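Appendix B: complex inputs.
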Amino acid sequence: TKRFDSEKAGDREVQRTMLELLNQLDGFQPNTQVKVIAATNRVDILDPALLRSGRLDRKIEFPMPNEEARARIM
Amino acid sequence: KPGDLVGVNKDSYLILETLPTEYDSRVKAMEVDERPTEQYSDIGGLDKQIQELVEAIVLPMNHKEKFENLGIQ
Amino acid sequence: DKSKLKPGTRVALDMTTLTIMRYLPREVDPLVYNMSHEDPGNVSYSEIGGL
Amino acid sequence: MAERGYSFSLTTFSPSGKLVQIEYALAAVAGGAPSVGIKAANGVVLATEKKQKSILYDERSVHKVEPITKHIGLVYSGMGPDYRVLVHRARKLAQQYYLVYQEPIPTAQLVQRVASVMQEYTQSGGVRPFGVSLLICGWNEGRPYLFQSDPSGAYFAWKATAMGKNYVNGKTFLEKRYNEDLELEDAIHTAILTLKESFEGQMTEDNIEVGICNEAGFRRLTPTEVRDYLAAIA
Amino acid sequence: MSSIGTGYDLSASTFSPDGRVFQVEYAMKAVENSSTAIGIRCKDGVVFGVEKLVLSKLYEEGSNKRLFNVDRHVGMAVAGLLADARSLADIAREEASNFRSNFGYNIPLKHLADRVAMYVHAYTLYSAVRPFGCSFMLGSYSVNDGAQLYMIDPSGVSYGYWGCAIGKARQAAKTEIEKLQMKEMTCRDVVKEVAKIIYIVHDEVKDKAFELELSWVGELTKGRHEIVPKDVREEAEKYAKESLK
Amino acid sequence: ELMPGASGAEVKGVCTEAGMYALRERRVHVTQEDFEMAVAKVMQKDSEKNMSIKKLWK
Amino acid sequence: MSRGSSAGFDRHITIFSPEGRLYQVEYAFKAINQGGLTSVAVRGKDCAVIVTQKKVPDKLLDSSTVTHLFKITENIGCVMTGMTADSRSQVQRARYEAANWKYKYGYEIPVDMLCKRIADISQVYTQNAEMRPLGCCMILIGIDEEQGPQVYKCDPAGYYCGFKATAAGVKQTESTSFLEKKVKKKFDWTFEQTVETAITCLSTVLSIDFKPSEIEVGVVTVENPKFRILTEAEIDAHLVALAERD
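Resulting structure:
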């Protein structure tokens, strides 16, 4: 996660690695044809640069289930 | 070209051989392992969602011609 | 030619008698060389447009 | 209100012997625009410079010099938001005192009364200690009064004091030029010198305001007069 | 958002570097998780429709009330978590109740939507009480504006709508409303149509059964707000099932 | 009396500065008048740091 | 770091900080940009005009209902700029304050006085740790009962001052700069000219040029004290006028 003003620690190997995904991810270096299946329980901790539509185009929800959905699993 | 591996002899620096460009050991782990089927019917409920994932992920790769016909990226 | 060899440029030397054997072109880094040579993706001017 | 609320104090002492938030507040008054207040002993003059820096302010009303009532005036230092409550507060107090005495609030008395409310704001929770310093002027009972009210609550009665940008330099000039019981002309002149000490808030007439208290009440001065006093200082 | 270990998402009298409280956003997910409430503005009245999920087969209509009658001309249709919906219902009822009794005329909605949203928002500001994780609509027939429908979000923002849906498939429902002209159409036809959108939303492979509560405030009832008459209610559901297939 | 100081550096600087004024002027001695100009220079530099809320390190 | 550092509990609630203001207070300024609205305020000498972007995020809205222009009194009109959640809430608070004067005084409240009562109100929010400051600012227009048309704006932290020209928005500093050159070069102010300055300045910085249903213009003229909504036809009229200036 980028948000650093860290002069006290905070590694910044980790800073490079999130930034690098964007780099690969811009159109200049192809990524049109390859899909990335991204998964997170918390999108409540991420930033918009990594997420946000048209960088990872489709955004698929899975809301809580209901009785029929319970019915088929059982 | 730049990025290519090439061998060179230690005892006197001549090019031993030419090798093609290749990934780290960690990356080899990252490559395919494959996962087995839960089958669409068999993975219980969430019906509207089976459609959303199938359409997005697997179809543009496998059922590619229909997408080319749509004209989308 | 004495003129070819300068502070900026590179030379190759005998490892066994250190006389300048020959001249080599300037300093370069392999990462730089590929970045300059290549231009993938291209990118259309039209898109950024309207702004 | 429609919630539980707070009541815990945001200030805790130190084994230093200090209260932490008032020291941060003191930094904010210094970050202001120069405001000086001198009691001459032939009237009280409060002068300030106001950073507008565009003169797209059609103020014929609110300013950094605002009259509280007809023989009290107020000038601040620091930030504007904290001023807004204090100026309204002072007007209310002016009204409370007007009803019984019917001579609007005296300066010695005003400060004690503001000081008590300021102290609560530190002492209590769901409120916070100011970071404005007020300079209060008044002429009432045939004596001029000048007080300075600190963002903690403290009040000191001064002959001449400075606040706002480069106050340390201001207070030191004030001691040298001004000595106690000099004339109304000296008080005004040094007052405008402190603003000139360091300006940088657009040099046009409407960017300095002075308001003067004297025997006949309090009025704020037109920006054009203020400029004439400045013009002398190079 | 952030998941800081002291405040910001753990308080709500604290704004983020950008100026937003993460706590209202977590609450905004809650309307999405359960069933939809649709409500469209007519000009002879307003027609509301909330699908009430048959969770238990031993319930009767009036259970897990998503439809409230705010006054005798004001409705409230909610979507999202029912506990925050109840609070919002209680305030709305008292605000509407004083206005008919005292003034003697029907309430213009636009002010009412602003006041209730003020209530939502005042609580967001506070860290001592919570943002409301419901989205709800208010609908009224007036003699100063005619029909009005306003939708207030879990953030306390009010906008007027010709036709709204808040729930687990906003995108599918809004679009169906766009295609149709119900904006100035007669309330009677609308009853059938609002039910039919509920039918698309509902799945027989994500839900078993629902019980339709629609509410009239329109020309049948002569502008009186009642929960849908049993005959009409059935007629409208009957059409909804028949027309898909 | 005139300097309020702030450092041993400030004290030391009054002397060094008097040499810089004498050199400019091309004196072959250091005069009493030079020290007067120097303190005053040094003083002024202190005041700039005082305004900024700084010690001797920025 | 800065703008997110503990020094008391001042990056959480209002108390001063190392920055010489308040962190919590500064998020409340930062908050204005998020809403996405930008406003230009010009003070005429026959009217006082505010133009602000009207946030339209659906195609299922009725035009009349969806606005940010509010009638505070039959003398004062306003636009809300910043976060819309905070906008509805401040307006309802103001309204009680306007009404409170209204019975006592027996006449329409001055634009200066309306701004003074609300400004102080925004200060209570700011002084308190019980609630966070408003994410919005209310910018007032009105005919002052002798001074003339007046434009006052109260901050989201609540301080108010008078203006010839004001701007608040996403880009607060740049709009204000564009706006001083329009004042300097003085075309003079009639009903149409002053409205025209105001819209163009909002268009030039952001570099859009609008539809009449995505800007809103609100005036208080000396035709009558009552505040009016001009509606799309008259707003369109002003848009076309902007061409081939000055």
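Residues 4-232 of chain D form a domain with the Glutamine Phosphoribosylpyrophosphate, subunit 1, domain 1 fold (CATH 3.60.20.10).
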